[PDB]
Amino acid sequence: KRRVVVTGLGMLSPVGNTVESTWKAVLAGQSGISLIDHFDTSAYATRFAGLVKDFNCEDYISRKDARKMDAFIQYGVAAGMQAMQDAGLDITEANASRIGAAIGSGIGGLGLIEENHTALVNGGPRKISPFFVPSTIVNMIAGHLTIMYGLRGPSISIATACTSGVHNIGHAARIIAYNDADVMVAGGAEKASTPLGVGGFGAARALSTRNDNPQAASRPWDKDRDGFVLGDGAGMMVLEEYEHAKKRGAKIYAEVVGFGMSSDAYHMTSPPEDGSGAALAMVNALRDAGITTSQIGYINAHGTSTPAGDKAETQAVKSVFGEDAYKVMVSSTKSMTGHLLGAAGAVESIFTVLALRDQAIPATINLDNPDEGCDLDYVPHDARQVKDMEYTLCNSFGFGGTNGSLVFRKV
Amino acid sequence: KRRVVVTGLGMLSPVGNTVESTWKAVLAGQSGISLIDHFDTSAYATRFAGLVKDFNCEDYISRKDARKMDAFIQYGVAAGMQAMQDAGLDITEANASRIGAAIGSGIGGLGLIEENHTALVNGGPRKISPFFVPSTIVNMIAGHLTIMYGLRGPSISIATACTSGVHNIGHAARIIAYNDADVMVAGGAEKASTPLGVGGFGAARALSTRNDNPQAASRPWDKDRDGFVLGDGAGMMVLEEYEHAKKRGAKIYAEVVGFGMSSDAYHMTSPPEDGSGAALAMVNALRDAGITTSQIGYINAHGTSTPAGDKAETQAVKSVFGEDAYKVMVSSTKSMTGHLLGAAGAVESIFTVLALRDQAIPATINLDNPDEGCDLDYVPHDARQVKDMEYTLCNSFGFGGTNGSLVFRKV
């Protein structure tokens, strides 16, 4: 069996423009939630979001090109480039066929779709950009990155809303484990903080409305949560077959040991009280790892700060772990970053990897008051330091009842 | 080692609302290209497309549900049911965890994004539909289907533009072969005949402009081809593990034996003149099959009717098959259907499977004059009848330079 490892990281988040800066901010509990100011939020019930600050795409992409790609692709490409240099692979003609990509997104280029539509409405079809389609569709990040680095291996893009990042990472490992690839760039990127994005989620009343204290709005498992907080960003991993990485002597962050999947088959947006589908996914990830519930130190929960959702996940954690539950620490970093959607699973899977490296677990900020049936150890306010920890569990449960989990092992 | 077979078919296309009706029209060489009507095409250079005709979604799903769906989700769901009904699956509780879905789309619900955006512009974020997000994002076809039939297994949605159909089917087989599921519903759906969709491809100058003779416009490998014709529809397959299929006495259409992936790493929309990316994908699908070039009877080519693209595919077939290039028959059904994008790989893979069943090969209509560097047997005008064919190859080469090919075996 071919073992798969993480040999390169890159990311853009609301609390940092690099991996390490974001990780520092995460451990120190700094919030990335700000007020939106790039469009008039007068009529909107929600006026804040987790935004990427001081991002200049001209470090990564010339502006001539950056005009041919929606912001979510710009993030994705940037984060991909970070991971590539972090990996330090040599791309040769004998290598190319064996290096590919698995990068997705939940919503994609909403921003550039809005632009082009207004242009169409105002000026007709001839005011539509000739690069409309390549700038907006979900798989164009991998499109840009493969071409940039001359990667000619398998290239896919899984779009499963909030489960994108996890699914992409997971299936990238499957592709490598199947011998179809030796190296994969995997992850997700998102920028749904647009008029339609904020408006759309607002119309569904899935958004928090605590405009008076934005950085306290995201409060998973707290009593006064009123919906999730929207966030932008991109997370990217370089996955590699294990012997291949050592033979070239790469820095090896962690091992991808388990990948489990399931669906709720319940409701399109809300999860089941029981959490059967979420539980199913973790059981599967664990079976894939050949590992028991009592070997897991930390669970990066979905933890979206939604009423129904946060309850479901806990009930699912209790169901799977039984009563290793209270011994195990369960934190959502979404208290800081907000919900990144398609990039959520990728950015959070990086935290679970870094957590193993540094043996430090991020806290769930704004957990001032436990909810009714929320008794587990959510690492309430400050980052713990733990020791001799070896297995991590990363969760994401997306719209459509799509569930996915990854298990990482310390190496 | 787990073998994967096809136990169910369902589809919606420009030439039929069922599989057998579509198949009939394809063998009879009927065109599905019509002039567009659901918006004013006065200012558009291209005013025709392959449209699904006489489709009523209330045949399949109630109008309240119908209301919360973009057209591409409606098509996908309808075809999903057809496949499930054809499969004759007994969904019990234990069974349920072992059945999932892998259904994608290249562009998704562009139509309803236009509608809600126009509403927003006219009335503000409070006139956005509360079902905006669940009605537009790509992975909601699998979402509805899982809920409908109580499927709790793995659920993904690969969004790789024109290659979506093939990647979804292929990875559905991988999931089954890896043992993460026993049954998988797979395929793609597309509805890009919208003002922004036709305008977007029109802006890129990739579309045909033969408005005077719409049904002769799609003419792959002809000398006077002037771009692809956009098409709509949805194709779906129920994939299943061989032992599981026989034990229940299933209708077995064929075997999924090979799956190849690659990327061009060259340009965002145009393919290279070789061949090389397309060649890689075919070679890998061949290797996956454990099979030689001389064992494949028919190639359902990508064949979009584009100047560069058609020449590239031929050259790709030359390099791979060598001496058998001329012994092998190569046809694109896009001559009649047009290019269905993310549903192209799905609907055509069905043609490759039906070809095995009936030992009949569809022609590529409008082939009046082969191009200069075209020397292969394209099945010029009429459907051919063949015997002893055991292997088929289905190709799809989509934007972003992502390539895929599936190998099917008669059994």
Residue numbers in the entry:
A (entry chain B), B (entry chain A): 2 to 412
The publication says:
The β-ketoacyl-acyl carrier protein (ACP) synthases, FabB, FabF, and FabH, catalyse the Claisen condensation of fatty acyl-thioesters and malonyl-ACP to form a β-ketoacyl-ACP intermediate elongated by two carbon atoms. The initial cycle of elongation is catalysed by FabH, involving condensation of malonyl-ACP and acetyl-CoA, while subsequent cycles of elongation are performed by FabB or FabF. The active site of all three enzymes consists of a catalytic triad centred around a cysteine residue, with FabB and FabF enzymes both possessing a Cys/His/His catalytic triad1920, while FabH possesses a Cys/His/Asn catalytic triad2122. Here we describe the crystal structures of the Yersinia pestis β-ketoacyl-ACP synthases FabF and FabH, and compare these with the unpublished, deposited structure of FabB, presenting three promising targets for the development of new antimicrobials to combat MDR Y. pestis strains.
YpFabF crystals displayed P1211 symmetry, with the unit cell parameters a = 74.67, b = 63.91, c = 89.29 Å, α = 90, β = 107.14, c = 90°. Based on a molecular weight of 45,500 Da, the asymmetric unit was estimated to contain two YpFabF molecules, with a solvent content of 45.09% and a Matthews coefficient of 2.24 Å3 Da−1. The refined structure of YpFabF contains a dimer within the asymmetric unit, with the YpFabF monomer containing 13 α-helices and 14 β-strands. Additionally, YpFabF exhibits a similar pattern of dimerisation, with strand β5 of each monomer arranged in an antiparallel fashion, however these β-strands are not positioned to form a contiguous 10-strand β-sheet as observed in YpFabH. The YpFabF monomers are related by a two-fold crystallographic axis with the most prominent interactions occurring between strand β5, helix α7, and the adjoining loop regions (residues ~160–170) of each monomer, with helix α7 (residues ~170–180) and strand β5 (residues 157–158) interacting with this loop and their counterparts on the opposing monomer. Additional interactions are formed between α7 and α10, α4 and α6 that pack against the loop region connecting β8 and α10, and α5, which packs against helices α5 and α8 of the opposing monomer. In total, this dimer interface buries approximately 18% (~2,890 Å2) of the solvent accessible surface area. The order of substrate binding and thus reaction order in FabF and FabB is thought to be controlled by residue Phe401 (YpFabF numbering) which acts as a “gatekeeper”, rotating upon acylation of the active site cysteine to expand the substrate binding pocket and allow the fatty acyl thioester, malonyl-ACP, to be elongated 2049. Platencin exhibits ~4 fold greater inhibitory activity (IC50 = 16.2 μM) compared with platensimycin23242551, with docking of platencin and platensimycin into the active site of YpFabF and YpFabH showing that the terminal carboxylic acids of platencin and platensimycin form hydrogen bonds with residues His243 and Asn273 of YpFabH, and His304 and His341 of YpFabF.
